[PDB]
């Protein structure tokens, strides 16, 4: 539960008829951010300010949205909302908020013509609150599917999931993940819990079938996604937040196979607090971020 971390509120906007939506994490306490874009087909906005050799931005929130490339318009909706509320970097003549975002492709379920837009991004911001939030097919996970080797028609439902890992000394690492993976999702024993299905409903085993020669028939296959946020209540430097984002992908690798494919836009954002007493080695935090991400992947499909 991402809101276990100080200062974070989460809001969804959900369109259950079109099967799309967006989710925003809003930061009421200043954060130090990082990012790792590992998939080969990602669409994002504002990620350059999240690398270690860029200046320290003022990140107002981070958004996970559907709508493919179109859905980044909801991030601009959030930017406009935050400016009206008086948040963002103060340049005297204006305040400039920043809402980095990454997308999934969810246009092949429901209505392809409806995508998160300026208004939907505002709605998610308005709805953002502390405490527990809903998981499953809501917000950015509304139109998510898993296991697209044979097309969306033989896929399993995806979703939005969350988990918190507790360490010593009050340290926490939490994740919030939208699972829309090309590949199958497995538990810790290696059983398939969501994935590509044969016509009658048994799991095919995507990787096994690909080794035998079955070819990718998903909508994006002709050009040659799991997105999420990992957050800690530790203080981080920019270099450490980017290292945490990099290590968190290991958790995706343990749950999802194949992962980081040519049709995946896999992206992890990471945050720590600018002002906190708590510190810990980044390799430990990163390992816990991997565990949190893995658990959040499973959460997405059991809710």
> Which residues of this protein are in contact with its own copies, per CB under 8 A?
37, 40-49, 53-58, 68-70, 72-73, 76, 79-80, 83, 89, 91-94, 96-98, 105, 107-108, 112-113, 118, 219-220, 222-224, 262, 265
| Contact call for residue 35 and Na ion (CB under 5 A) | no
Measured from the CB atom, the residue of 49 and 167 that comes closer to its own copies is: 49
Q: Give Cα 234 to chain centroid, integer Å.
A: 20
Residues 6+ apart with CB under 8 A from 233: 5, 6, 170, 171, 172, 272, 273, 276, 278
Other beta carbons within 10 Å of 123: 23
Residues 6+ apart with CB under 8 A from 213: none
108 binds, among its own copies, Na ion, none (CB under 5 to 8 A by kind): its own copies
91 binds, among its own copies, Na ion, none (CB under 5 to 8 A by kind): its own copies
Provide, rounded to whole angstroms, the least separation between the CB of residue 51 and its own copies: 9
Supply 148's token pair: 């697209």
| Contact call for residue 145 and Na ion (CB under 5 A) | no
76 binds, among its own copies, Na ion, none (CB under 5 to 8 A by kind): its own copies
Instruction: Tell me the CA end-to-end span of the chain in Å, nearest whole number.
Output: 13
Residue 126 DSSP class? H
* H or E stretch covering 245: helix 238-255
State the Cα angle at 176 between 114 and 287, rounded to 5°. 145
| Contact call for residue 242 and Na ion (CB under 5 A) | no
104 binds, among its own copies, Na ion, none (CB under 5 to 8 A by kind): Na ion
| Contact call for residue 109 and Na ion (CB under 5 A) | no
The single residue among 60, 225, 231, 232 that binds Na ion, judged by CB under 5 A, is 225
225 binds, among its own copies, Na ion, none (CB under 5 to 8 A by kind): Na ion
Give the closest residue to 160 by CA, choosing from 184, 175, 140, 185: 140
Supply 15's token pair: 């369109």
Measured from the CB atom, the residue of 59 and 300 that comes closer to its own copies is: 59
Which residues of this chain interact with Na ion, rule CB under 5 A?
Answer: 104-105, 180, 225
């Amino acid at each position: 539960m991402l809101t276990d971390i100080d200062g974070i509120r989460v809001g969804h906007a959900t369109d259950a008829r079109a099967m799309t939506g967006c989710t925003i994490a809003v930061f009421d306490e200043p954060v130090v951010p990082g990012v790792d874009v590992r998939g080969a087909n990602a669409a994002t906005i504002y990620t350059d300010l999240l690398y270690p050799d860029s200046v320290m931005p003022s990140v107002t929130g981070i958004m996970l949205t559907g709508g493919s490339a179109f859905g980044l318009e909801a991030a601009l909706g959030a930017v406009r909302y935050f400016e009206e509320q008086g948040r963002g970097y103060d340049v005297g003549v204006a305040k400039i908020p920043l809402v980095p975002a990454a997308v999934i492709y969810d246009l092949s379920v429901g209505d392809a013509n409806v995508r998160p837009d300026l208004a939907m991004g505002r709605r998610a911001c308005e709805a953002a609150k502390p405490g527990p939030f809903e998981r499953g097919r809501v917000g950015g996970g509304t139109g998510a599917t898993v296991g697209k080797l044979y097309g969306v028609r033989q896929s399993s439902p995806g979703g939005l999931g969350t988990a918190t890992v507790s360490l010593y000394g009050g340290i926490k690492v939490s994740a919030m993940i939208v699972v829309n993976s090309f590949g199958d999702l497995r538990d810790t024993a290696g059983r398939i819990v969501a994935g590509a299905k044969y016509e009658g409903g048994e799991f095919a085993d995507t990787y096994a079938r690909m080794k035998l020669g079955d070819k990718n028939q998903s909508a994006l296959a002709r050009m040659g996604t799991t997105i999420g946020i990992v957050s800690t209540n530790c203080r981080l430097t920019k270099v450490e937040a980017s290292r945490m984002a990099t290590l968190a992908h290991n958790g995706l690798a343990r749950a999802i196979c194949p992962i980081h494919t040519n049709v995946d836009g896999d992206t992890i954002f990471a945050t720590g607090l600018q002002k906190s007493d708590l510190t810990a080695p980044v390799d430990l935090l990163g390992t816990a971020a991997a565990e949190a991400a893995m658990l959040a992947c499973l959460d997405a499909v059991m809710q």
